[PDB]
Symmetry: C2
Subunit: 128 residues, 2 copies
């Protein structure tokens, strides 16, 4: 499988009120065996200067990351579109910050893949 | 004259509770003839992918921008360090967002320059 589509995209977005992340894969995702988590990333003193730097940080996290050593976003996932689309619904609106979603997916073809998708939320839980 | 340094710098910073922007120029700034404004930028639907894109948005603003066409930050400015450093104090903590600071400076050498500085505040007010 591979990721076809993700919203928010890999971008600095405003999106005040954001409370969901959507991923669309190229194949149906098998339930149970596929898992999804997201993190609010700690930015280094004086920040990051492009999304390449953000991607480097995000690439080190995974589904077996330890929650107490990081800042996990609590969320609930559901499968749709004959299980090719995954919607991650956050408990409350996401504040501003840099975020990564990480996964391990077993696809209908029987292969397991891992990956991540990262973005910068420049809006807050509500409109300025 | 040119900008030597700025804090926040041109980056994506967390900086929860940010309420001031410091700019340091290469020459003393003349008060009154020099002015400073800041704006919280509207990002496009697709978001932006890099800070060059941020620069593009910021570079169109200036000291003669119309306040009602934008989202201006209410602030007070203060000169120091024999007038080469400018501190911009925001009236409330800055909410998260992309920002631009713009200026027109008259330097003690009698020359006027314009410029801008942009950053992304990815943290909140606390
Ligand atoms: Cu000059």
């Amino acid at each position: 499988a591979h990721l076809r589509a993700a919203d928010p995209p890999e971008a600095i977005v405003d999106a005040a009120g954001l409370r969901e992340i959507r991923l669309v894969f190229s194949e149906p995702v098998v339930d149970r065996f596929s898992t999804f988590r997201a993190f609010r990333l700690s930015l280094p003193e004086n920040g990051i200067r492009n999304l390449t730097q953000l991607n480097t940080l995000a690439s080190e996290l995974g589904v077996d990351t330890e929650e107490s050593a990081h800042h996990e976003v609590e969320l609930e996932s559901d499968l749709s579109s004959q299980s090719a689309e995954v919607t991650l619904h956050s408990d409350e609106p996401l504040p501003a910050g840099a975020y990564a979603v990480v996964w391990r997916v077993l696809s209908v073809d029987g292969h397991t893949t891992t990956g991540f998708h990262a973005f910068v939320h420049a809006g807050g839980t509500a409109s300025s």
